[PDB]
């Protein structure tokens, strides 16, 4: 560095960068209408009463969940497939895959919008789990996500047909291990020649510290409302921050890359099917 956003676009265009790893958080889904935790006003920090929560993280904590699983299953009902749609930031990542640049997309989101936008499962690491499947909390029987959908849509807590235990969708709660696919980080992060970080506060580990695992010559490009994490206090010479709305930062990168019309056509065709 010091690099600019235009410098990074030129490394991509010169094919100096061919293997992009991406890390994303809830801020890429707020334009789709899904509240995050930390945004002023709309974030869960500011809307505890709506979900009946003592604080926002309780919604992903097992002791609170077993005491009262209802706040969690309200969110599950909102977030179950079919309700929210991917926005331009998702279709940008889809285009990055279609253009041969995506080594892997690590996400902390549980809205499933990366898959809905058409990125193959093999390119995705849903690090904090998924509503596509569920597990009995007592006997550990696995279930497809559709098997509990009716109960979820009716506000009934899903129960196991074998032991009557609560059936919990496979979303990683505080203190639980991330999925085995998360281990791909061991070979993905040394191999990355670019790291893109979008829409996250970098406040949850071990996901957050992945920003540290790329080689010191790799640029890290943050597109976020604010500067965050290992980035904001362990700065490196090739880090680039594009602060502002996430979609505006992505639009500005897409235009420097030469991809605007193609992105617009992709979005039209994808969102119009449903």
């Amino acid at each position: 560095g010091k690099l600019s956003l235009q410098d990074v676009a030129e490394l991509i265009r010169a094919r100096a960068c061919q293997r992009v790893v991406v890390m994303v958080g809830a801020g890429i889904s707020t334009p789709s209408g899904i509240p995050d935790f930390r945004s002023p006003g709309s974030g869960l920090y500011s809307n505890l009463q709506q979900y009946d929560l003592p604080y926002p993280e309780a919604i992903f904590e097992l002791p609170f969940f077993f005491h009262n699983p209802k706040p969690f299953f309200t969110l599950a009902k909102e977030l179950y497939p079919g309700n929210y749609k991917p926005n331009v930031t998702h279709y940008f990542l889809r285009l990055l895959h279609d253009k041969g640049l995506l080594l892997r997309l690590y996400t902390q989101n549980i809205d499933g919008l990366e898959r809905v936008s058409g990125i193959p499962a093999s390119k995705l690491v849903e690090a904090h789990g998924t509503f596509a499947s569920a597990t009995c909390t007592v006997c550990q029987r696995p279930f497809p996500g559709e098997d509990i959908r009716a109960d979820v849509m009716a506000d009934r807590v899903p129960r196991c047909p074998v032991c009557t235990g609560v059936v919990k969708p496979d979303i990683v709660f505080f203190g639980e291990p991330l999925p085995q696919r998360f281990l791909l980080h061991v070979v993905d992060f040394p191999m990355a020649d670019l790291l893109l970080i979008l829409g996250t506060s970098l406040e949850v580990e071990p996901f957050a510290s992945l920003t540290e695992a790329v080689r010191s010559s790799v640029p890290r490009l943050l597109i976020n409302r604010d500067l965050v994490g290992p980035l904001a206090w362990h700065p490196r010479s090739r880090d680039v921050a594009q602060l502002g709305d996430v979609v505006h930062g992505v639009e500005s990168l897409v235009e420097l890359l030469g991809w605007t019309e193609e992105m617009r056509d992709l979005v039209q065709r994808e969102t119009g099917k449903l």
């Binding site: 505080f174 639980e176 291990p177 991330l178 998360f182 406040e203 949850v204 580990e205 071990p206």
Partner: peptide, 6 residues
Amino acid sequence: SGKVMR
């Protein structure tokens, strides 16, 4: 792992 704050 596991998942933890901060």
